[PDB]
């Protein structure tokens, strides 16, 4: 009893394959067959079955759509069908049966590589818990120097839109009082409020505009203690 | 100044949409248009950007392909057409604007709300490091409640596939030696290795098989001190 996937291995962004697991030493045709892959240096994350029967098909969230998981009874053997390749969908394909009904992977085949061919933006704290009349400060770390400083913040409050606050990393915004203010140069930039107002309570992104591919960080939440 | 986004709501797994940003105010044809997304309960992400006249696009990695950016000046109008939608293009997506040739986007639409149609498993520690004879203790901590008889532990070592070692949280496959043994009930599940071999240092992964999407843990890894 064995599994061996084919097919796979390098593909552009949005490219397409089609894998294959020739099974081996069992029935085919009535156990059930999946799709186990992991990326490198990352852990083991389901794919796709086929249930018995063709027609009978689940996916993981992420693969819904842009894969097909078929099988062809007659040859043993059973297929996926990749569309609309990602970088992140780069990974090791697995192919995995468990013997009966349901239970757990038994066996697994070799496995066969697929890969598809930015600065980070870490804002800390996660959360800043204030009171009005305080001093938040708010930090963007970016992974790598930034040119000019084109370096811009947003407010977010639930439901509305973001806000412009700073853009240039010192200049303010049409609109935006003297509390706010931004500085720091390099990889390492600072959002200050000098004292917080009941409005001021919201999320906060930095905003990175110097290649033609911007980024955001994920976000300080400045809320009420 | 204005921008209105349209379009967008529910969409099947694999299915597509066309959005649109209408824009008053300004006059069209002098500046260019950015769309970026947030999905619920996480920050901006970049999309897509028509710079100036059509046939100047720029996208992010994830939507390489499946999304096509235009825009036609004589209606006033920003288009964005996402094809293979996946349960990950899930966001309310706002157009975005900047004055000038370039800059920080300080003109913002409402954004418009996209959405397209789960047991986790946290294991600790991430690294165990440790000497041959000692014991070795690894937990599984499940978001929700888990029957037993739905969850199993892989061994896995570098360019090799898993390796099923309990499944049914104390029952072990064939050939896997007596010091290896599984405990545990409802949320939290436990991995206890007697006597640490040179053949045991590896990663180890907890599996729960109870619906049709079955999760992994991100992995233990177990080395040498």
């Known amino acids: 009893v064995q599994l061996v996937e084919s097919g796979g291995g390098l593909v552009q962004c949005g490219g397409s394959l089609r894998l294959s697991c020739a099974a081996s030493g069992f029935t085919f045709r009535n156990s059930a067959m999946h799709w186990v892959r992991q990326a490198p240096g990352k852990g083991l994350e389901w794919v796709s079955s086929i249930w018995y029967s063709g027609s009978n098909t689940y996916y993981a969230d992420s693969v819904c759509g842009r894969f097909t998981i078929s099988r062809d009874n007659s040859k043993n053997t059973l297929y996926l069908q990749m569309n609309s390749l990602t970088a992140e969908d780069t990974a090791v394909?697995?192919?995995?049966?468990?013997?009966?009904?349901?239970?757990?992977?038994?066996?697994?085949?070799?496995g066969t590589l697929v890969t598809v061919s930015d600065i980070v933006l870490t804002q800390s704290p996660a959360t800043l818990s204030l009171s009005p009349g305080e001093r938040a400060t708010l930090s963007c770390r970016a992974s790598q120097s930034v040119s000019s400083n084109y370096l811009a913040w947003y407010q977010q409050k639930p439901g509305q839109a973001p806000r412009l606050l700073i853009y240039?990393?010192?200049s303010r915004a049409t609109g935006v009082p003297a509390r706010f203010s931004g500085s720091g140069s390099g990889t390492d930039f600072t959002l200050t409020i000098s004292s917080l107002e009941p409005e001021d309570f919201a999320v906060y992104y930095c905003?990175?505009?110097?290649?033609?591919?911007?980024?955001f960080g994920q976000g300080t939440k400045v809320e009420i203690k | 100044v204005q921008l209105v986004e349209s379009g967008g709501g529910l969409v099947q797994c694999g299915g597509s949409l066309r959005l649109s940003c209408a824009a008053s105010g300004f006059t069209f044809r002098n500046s260019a248009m950015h769309w970026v997304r947030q999905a619920p309960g996480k920050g901006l992400e970049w999309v897509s950007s028509i710079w100036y006249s059509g046939s100047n696009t720029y996208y992010a990695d994830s939507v390489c392909g499946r999304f096509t950016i235009s825009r036609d000046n004589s209606k006033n109008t920003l288009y964005l057409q996402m094809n293979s939608l996946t349960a990950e293009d899930t966001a309310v997506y706002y157009c975005?604007?900047?004055?000038?040739?370039?800059?920080?986007?300080?003109?913002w639409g409402q954004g418009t709300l996209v959405t397209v149609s789960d047991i986790v498993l946290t294991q600790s520690p991430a690294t165990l490091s440790l000497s041959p004879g000692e014991r070795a203790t690894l937990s599984c901590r499940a978001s929700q409640s888990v029957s037993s008889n739905y969850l199993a532990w892989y061994q896995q070592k570098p360019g090799q596939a898993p390796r099923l070692?309990?499944?049914?949280?104390?029952?072990?496959?064939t050939g896997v030696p007596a010091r290896f043994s599984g405990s545990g009930s409802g949320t939290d599940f436990t991995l206890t290795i007697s006597s640490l071999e040179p053949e045991d240092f590896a990663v180890?992964?907890?599996?729960?098989?109870?619906?049709?999407?079955?999760?992994?843990?991100?992995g233990t890894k177990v080395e040498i001190k």
């Open positions: 905003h990175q505009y110097s290649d033609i591919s911007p980024t």
């Open positions: 240039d990393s010192s």
């Open positions: 975005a604007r900047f004055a000038g040739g370039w800059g920080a986007y300080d003109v």
